[PDB]
Amino acid sequence: PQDRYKAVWLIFFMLGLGTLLPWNFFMTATQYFTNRLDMNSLSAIFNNVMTLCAMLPLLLFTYLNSFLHQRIPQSVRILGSLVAILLVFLITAILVKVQLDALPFFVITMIKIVLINSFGAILQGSLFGLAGLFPASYTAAIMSGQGLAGFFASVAMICAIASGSELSESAFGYFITACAVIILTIICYLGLPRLEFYRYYQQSIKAILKKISVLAFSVCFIFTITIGMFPAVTVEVKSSRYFIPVSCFLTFNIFDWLGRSLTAVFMWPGKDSRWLPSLVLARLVFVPLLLLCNIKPRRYLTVVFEHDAWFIFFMAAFAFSNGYLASLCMCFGPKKVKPAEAETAGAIMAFFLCLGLALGAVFSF
Numbered sequence: 001p002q003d004r005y006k007a008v009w010l011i012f013f014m015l016g017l018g019t020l021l022p023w024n025f026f027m028t029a030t031q032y033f034t035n036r037l038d039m040n041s042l043s044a045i046f047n048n049v050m051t052l053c054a055m056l057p058l059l060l061f062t063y064l065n066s067f068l069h070q071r072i073p074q075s076v077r078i079l080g081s082l083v084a085i086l087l088v089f090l091i092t093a094i095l096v097k098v099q100l101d102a103l104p105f106f107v108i109t110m111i112k113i114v115l116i117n118s119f120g121a122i123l124q125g126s127l128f129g130l131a132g133l134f135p136a137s138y139t140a141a142i143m144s145g146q147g148l149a150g151f152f153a154s155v156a157m158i159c160a161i162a163s164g165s166e167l168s169e170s171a172f173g174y175f176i177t178a179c180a181v182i183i184l185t186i187i188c189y190l191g192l193p194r195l196e197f198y199r200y201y202q203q204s205i206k207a208i209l210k211k212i213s214v215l216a217f218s219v220c221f222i223f224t225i226t227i228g229m230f231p232a233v234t235v236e237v238k239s240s241r242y243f244i245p246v247s248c249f250l251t252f253n254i255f256d257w258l259g260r261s262l263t264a265v266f267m268w269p270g271k272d273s274r275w276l277p278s279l280v281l282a283r284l285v286f287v288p289l290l291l292l293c294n295i296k297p298r299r300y301l302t303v304v305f306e307h308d309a310w311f312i313f314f315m316a317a318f319a320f321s322n323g324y325l326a327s328l329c330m331c332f333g334p335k336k337v338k339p340a341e342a343e344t345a346g347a348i349m350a351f352f353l354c355l356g357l358a359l360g361a362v363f364s365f
């Protein structure tokens with residue numbers, strides 16, 4: 001078992017990048033959607049409708065994959081999901097240049113979001129089921145790719161604000177970049193069968209869940225907390241146009257990406273250590289901490305940590321805990337079960353992850 005040139009690993013990393021870089025960009029273009037709808041109102045309900053249509057299909061299709069991934073080849077699932085996402089994003093880019101009233105644009109945007117989240121649900125689940133067969137480092141690879149997707153999203157946001165370009169132009173660029181990335185990801189995947197390291201490892205749900213129940217609930221809780229606090233609540237912090245982006249999104253994405261990466265080479269406390277759920281639980285402390293920072297306009301709660309340094313430090317620790325512990329759970333879940341089931345376990349984990357998102361999306365509401 002020799003991953004020459006780390007090829008397989010690299011590819012998996014790229015794959016991770018491709019799962020969030022398309023959708024992450026879609027979340028970076030929210031200003032553009034709301035500004036085009038400006039032309040009760042659609043813009044005012046846009047975010048809520050988007051979260052609904054994103055988390056419900058995501059959850060449903062991740063569950064269906066957890067149940068039926070064995071029934072469809074992984075090549076089919078992966079390639080088809082990627083092609084569907086690419087086509088949807090190409091249509092998204094086209095619509096930027098075509099005239100369309102606010103209501104048809106709103107509805108078509110929500111349809112594209114439903115399709116993105118569905119196909120990407122199956123794609124993500126299939127990717128984590130695949131990486132479950134490979135060493136833990138190769139699930140850490142997917143997590144690192146996701147972290148880099150977030151990092152690129154943050155940098156692109158900052159540059160779109162700095163470039164002084166029109167929201168339509170910057171959003172067009174976002175969509176085209178996402179399409180190019182999806183093409184690159186497809187190419188990367190197609191280059192897997194030709195790697196002997198990839199062919200070396202490619203050669204009852206209640207029970208599998210009971211075996212990985214601890215780590216599954218762990219990742220679910222991690223993302224519950226994270227999405228309950230980030231970004232809905234953290235974006236309301238004010239200094240005591242570049243403060244919020246840089247101090248919130250940039251810091252979070254940087255430290256989350258680096259944490260997700262560290263799990264590739266350093267995997268403490270391990271898969272059987274009860275310290276991992278303990279740290280996951282300890283992450284609860286970020287709810288009071290982050291809620292008591294310099295939020296404005298503040299009404300029902302005070303500001304105990306007014307200086308921005310508190311906000312930056314809590315953001316660093318929060319994002320890094322998120323990344324590191326989520327990667328550890330995703331890596332150890334498939335390793336807490338026999339080989340013939342590691343593919344299901346992974347898939348199962350991919351569901352709970354999304355659950356942690358959905359619940360978080362509800363708690364942030």
Ligand SMILES: O=[N+]([O-])c1ccc(CSc2ncnc3c2ncn3[C@@H]2O[C@H](CO)[C@@H](O)[C@H]2O)cc1
Binds near residue numbers: 227
């Ligand atoms: O291929 N596709 O087009 C595609 C693939 C998957 C999806 C599901 S969306 C998703 N799936 C996993 N993880 C996410 C997601 N959205 C935010 N996150 C993480 O939440 C943490 C903060 O709470 C951050 O670290 C983020 O990485 C949509 C589109």
